[PDB]
Ligand binder design. Structure first.
Ligand SMILES: [Cl-]
Ligand SMILES: [Cl-]
Length: 164
């Protein structure tokens, strides 16, 4: 398994504009377009992102292109964040993918706010970290997805995604 297959499982793949779990216009593999309530604004951001008049629909290839951009940006964001970098550098490959997943979902700022969990992950206190990560709005609003990421941090294997 890899980060791409992981996100594919967690975000799904939609070729038409849709509303995510928080009600925001999104497209493809979890690519947020705008937090604005307006469909036209969504449509405008989409065309700007793709470089053509999409009419709110893209192809599979285009969706995967936005995902490559997004993963790459998540990674560079983590490496440049004083709070996230040290954690990421301390982790194994599997757990690094779990941190990317959280960044991708909630933004670097959001993740950098899990101060205590970050500290426990860096210390390699797996069970303690998993308990602390679960005391969050993230876990209460998207529990199935959060449990998969948390289990990944806990065990360091892709077990929660196998069968998916
Ligand atoms: Cl973009
Ligand atoms: Cl969920």
């Amino acid at each position: 398994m890899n980060i791409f297959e992981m996100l594919r499982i967690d975000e799904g793949l939609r070729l038409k504009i849709y509303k995510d779990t928080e009600g925001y216009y999104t497209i493809g593999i979890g690519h947020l377009l705008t937090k604005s309530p307006s469909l036209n604004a969504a449509k405008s951001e989409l065309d700007k992102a793709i470089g053509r008049n999409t009419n709110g629909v893209i192809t599979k290839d285009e969706a995967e292109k936005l995902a490559n951009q997004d993963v790459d940006a998540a990674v560079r964001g983590i490496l440049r964040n004083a709070k996230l970098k040290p954690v990421y550098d301390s982790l194994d490959a599997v757990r690094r993918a779990a941190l990317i997943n959280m960044v991708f979902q909630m933004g670097e700022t959001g993740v950098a706010g899990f101060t205590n969990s970050l500290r426990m992950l860096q210390q390699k206190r797996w069970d303690e970290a998993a308990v602390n990560l679960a005391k969050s709005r993230w876990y209460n609003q998207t529990p199935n997805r959060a449990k998969r990421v948390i289990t990944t941090f806990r065990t360091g294997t892709w077990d929660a995604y196998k069968n998916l």
